[PDB]
Amino acid sequence: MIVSFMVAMDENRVIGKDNNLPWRLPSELQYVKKTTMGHPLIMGRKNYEAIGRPLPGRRNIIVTRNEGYHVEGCEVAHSVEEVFELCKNEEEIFIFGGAQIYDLFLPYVDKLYITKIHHAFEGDTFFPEMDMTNWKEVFVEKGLTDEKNPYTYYYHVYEKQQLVPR
Numbered sequence: 001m002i003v004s005f006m007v008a009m010d011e012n013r014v015i016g017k018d019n020n021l022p023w024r025l026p027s028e029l030q031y032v033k034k035t036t037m038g039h040p041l042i043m044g045r046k047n048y049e050a051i052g053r054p055l056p057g058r059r060n061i062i063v064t065r066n067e068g069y070h071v072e073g074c075e076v077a078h079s080v081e082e083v084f085e086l087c088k089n090e091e092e093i094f095i096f097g098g099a100q101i102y103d104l105f106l107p108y109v110d111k112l113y114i115t116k117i118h119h120a121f122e123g124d125t126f127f128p129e130m131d132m133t134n135w136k137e138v139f140v141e142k143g144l145t146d147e148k149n150p151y152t153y154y155y156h157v158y159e160k161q162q163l164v165p166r
């Protein structure tokens with residue numbers, strides 16, 4: 001099971017402003033949709049409520065400590081262990097955010113899909129710092145910038161840098 005971070009962030013790692021994306025880039029969201037197709041989306045409750053609804057074609061799994069928390073068309077997990085058990089047969093899952101959710105899955109992450117937006121927005125939640133020396137870029141692509149997607153941004157994908165033995 002591949003554990004993958006799926007994230008869009010600005011030049012200071014902003015991922016949200018008052019439980020919202022500070023930007024509107026439909027093309028980016030269509031990239032997310034294409035990329036996570038057939039695979040679970042793992043998200044914290046706040047991330048989920050900020051998104052607004054179950055994202056179709058997709059196993060939506062909500063991570064909250066709240067044991068009474070239920071929403072229709074979703075699965076709820078209360079810990080990382082619970083998620084791994086729910087996804088026992090999955091090829092790959094996408095940790096979909098909540099800064100706190102990324103931190104929870106950090107010791108398990110194998111793959112990073114990071115959209116970097118070349119701009120500084122106002123924000124209050126951040127993608128946590130990571131040591132990128134442990135990571136190796138395998139794919140990059142400049143996002144579509146137009147009327148509907150005003151900012152410049154790039155899709156990046158990273159895998160573990162393998163150590164050469166001494």
Ligand SMILES: COc1cc(Cc2cnc(N)nc2N)cc(/C=C/C(=O)N2N=Cc3ccccc3[C@@H]2CCC(F)(F)F)c1OC
Pocket residue numbers: 006007008016019020021026028029030032033047050051055056057058095096097115
């Ligand atoms: C805080 O608010 C949000 C945060 C995130 C998290 C996120 C976004 N982008 C990247 N690259 N990584 C993330 N973790 C998504 C979203 C929304 C994602 C959103 O609306 N979608 N994202 C994937 C998806 C998968 C299946 C069906 C539908 C979707 C839609 C895309 C459909 C479209 F655009 F083609 F019509 C969000 O709400 C605006």
Ligand SMILES: [Ca+2]
Pocket residue numbers: 003107108109110
């Ligand atoms: Ca791993």
Ligand SMILES: [Cl-]
Pocket residue numbers: 043044045046047048097098099100101
């Ligand atoms: Cl969250």
